[PDB]
Amino acid sequence: VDKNYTVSAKDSAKLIEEVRKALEVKFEDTKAGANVNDRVYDIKVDNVNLTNATQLQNKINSLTEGQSLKVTIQDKGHQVLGGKVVDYKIENYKTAQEIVDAVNAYNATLAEDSDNKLTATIKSTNTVEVKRAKDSANVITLNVGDQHLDFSKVITSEEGTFEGYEKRYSDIDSKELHTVTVKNADLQDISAEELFDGIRLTTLGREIVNKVKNGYALTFENEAILTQEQEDSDDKDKPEKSSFDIVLSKANEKPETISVSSKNHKLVRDLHKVLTDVKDGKELKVEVLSGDSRFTTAVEVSKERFKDGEAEAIILVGEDAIVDGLASAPLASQKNAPILLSKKDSLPSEIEAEILRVLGSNLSSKKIYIVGGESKVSKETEEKLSKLGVSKVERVSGEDRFETSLEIAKQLKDTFKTAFVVGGNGEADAMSISARAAQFGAPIIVTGNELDANAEKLLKGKELEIVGGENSVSKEVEDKLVDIDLNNKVERLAGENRKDTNAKVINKYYAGATKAYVAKDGYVGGNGQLVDALTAAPLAASSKAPIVLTTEELSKSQEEVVELRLKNATKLVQIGEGIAKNAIEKIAEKINLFT
Ligand SMILES: [Cl-]
CA distance 47 to 391: 69
From ligand 1's centre to the CA of 433, what distance in Å? Answer: 25
Amino acid at 593: L
CA distance 66 to 581: 38
Contact assessment for residue 473 and residue 464, using Cβ atoms and an 8 Å cutoff: no
From ligand 1's centre to the CA of 222, what distance in Å? Answer: 24
From ligand 1's centre to the CA of 18, what distance in Å? Answer: 42
As to burial, measured by CB atoms within 10 angstroms (0-12 exposed, 13-18 middle, 19+ buried), residue 121 is exposed
From ligand 1's centre to the CA of 577, what distance in Å? Answer: 11
From ligand 1's centre to the CA of 552, what distance in Å? Answer: 19
Contact assessment for residue 337 and residue 306, using Cβ atoms and an 8 Å cutoff: no
From ligand 1's centre to the CA of 246, what distance in Å? Answer: 17
From ligand 1's centre to the CA of 411, what distance in Å? Answer: 35
From ligand 1's centre to the CA of 276, what distance in Å? Answer: 14
From ligand 1's centre to the CA of 513, what distance in Å? Answer: 21
CA distances to 152, 205, 341, 477 from 269, rounded to whole Å, are 63, 15, 39, 56
From ligand 1's centre to the CA of 279, what distance in Å? Answer: 14
From ligand 1's centre to the CA of 283, what distance in Å? Answer: 10
Count of all residues that appear for the chain in the document = 595
Where would I find the beta strands (DSSP E) of 1-83?
5-8, 41-45, 48-49, 68-75, 79-81
CA dihedral sign of residues 203, 207, 209, 213 = positive
Q: Which residues contact 502 (CB under 8 A, 6 or more apart)?
A: 432, 495, 521, 547, 548, 549, 550, 558
Contact assessment for residue 149 and residue 90, using Cβ atoms and an 8 Å cutoff: no
CA distance 579 to 518: 9
Q: Tell how strand 68-75 and strand 178-183 pair up.
A: antiparallel
DSSP output for 514-530: S-EEEE--STTT-GGGG
Q: How many CA within 13 A on the CB side of residue 339? A: 34
Per residue in 290-322, is it b (16+ CB within 10 Å) or e — as a string? Answer: bbebbbebbbbbbebbbeeeebbbbbbbbbbbb
Where would I find the beta strands (DSSP E) of 482-581?
491-493, 516-519, 547-549, 572-575
From ligand 1's centre to the CA of 272, what distance in Å? Answer: 14
Where would I find the beta strands (DSSP E) of 76-177?
79-81, 84-86, 88-90, 118-124, 127-132, 140-143, 149-154, 165-167, 169-171
Identify the experimental approach. Answer: X-ray
What does the angle CA 65 – CA 66 – CA 67 come to, to the nearest 5 degrees? 95
CA distance 211 to 231: 33
Q: How many CA within 13 A on the CB side of residue 367? A: 15
Nearest to 88 by CA among 145, 27, 168, 32: 32
Q: What is the CATH number of domain 185-283?
A: 3.30.720
From ligand 1's centre to the CA of 85, what distance in Å? Answer: 59
Amino acid at 316: L
Nearest to 311 by CA among 376, 241, 362: 362
From ligand 1's centre to the CA of 89, what distance in Å? Answer: 61
CA distance 270 to 262: 12
Rounding to the nearest 10 degrees, give the CA dihedral for residues 43, 48, 53, 59.
Answer: -140
From ligand 1's centre to the CA of 228, what distance in Å? Answer: 25
CA distances to 98, 240, 449, 551 from 341, rounded to whole Å, are 89, 48, 29, 22
Query: What are the φ/ψ torsions at residue 554 (nearest 5 degrees)?
Result: -60, 145
From ligand 1's centre to the CA of 556, what distance in Å? Answer: 27
From ligand 1's centre to the CA of 297, what distance in Å? Answer: 13
For the chain, which residues make up each domain, given as ranges?
A: 5-87+174-178, 92-167, 185-283, 291-502
Resolution (A): 2.1
CA distance 528 to 523: 10
Contact assessment for residue 242 and residue 262, using Cβ atoms and an 8 Å cutoff: yes
From ligand 1's centre to the CA of 529, what distance in Å? Answer: 20
Q: How many CA within 13 A on the CB side of residue 156? A: 4
CA distance 524 to 512: 31
Query: What are the φ/ψ torsions at residue 234 (nearest 5 degrees)?
Result: -70, 70
CA distance 171 to 79: 11
Per residue in 497-514, is it b (16+ CB within 10 Å) or e — as a string? Answer: ebbbbbbbbbbbbbeebe
Amino acid at 66: G
Strand ranges of the sheet holding 5-8, from the earlier edge strand across to the other edge: 5-8, 178-183, 68-75, 41-45, 48-49
From ligand 1's centre to the CA of 282, what distance in Å? Answer: 13
Q: Which residues contact 43 (CB under 8 A, 6 or more apart)?
A: 19, 22, 23, 49, 50, 71, 72, 73, 74
What is the 8-class DSSP label of residue 92? B
β-sheet bridge partners, residue 317: 341
From ligand 1's centre to the CA of 208, what distance in Å? Answer: 10
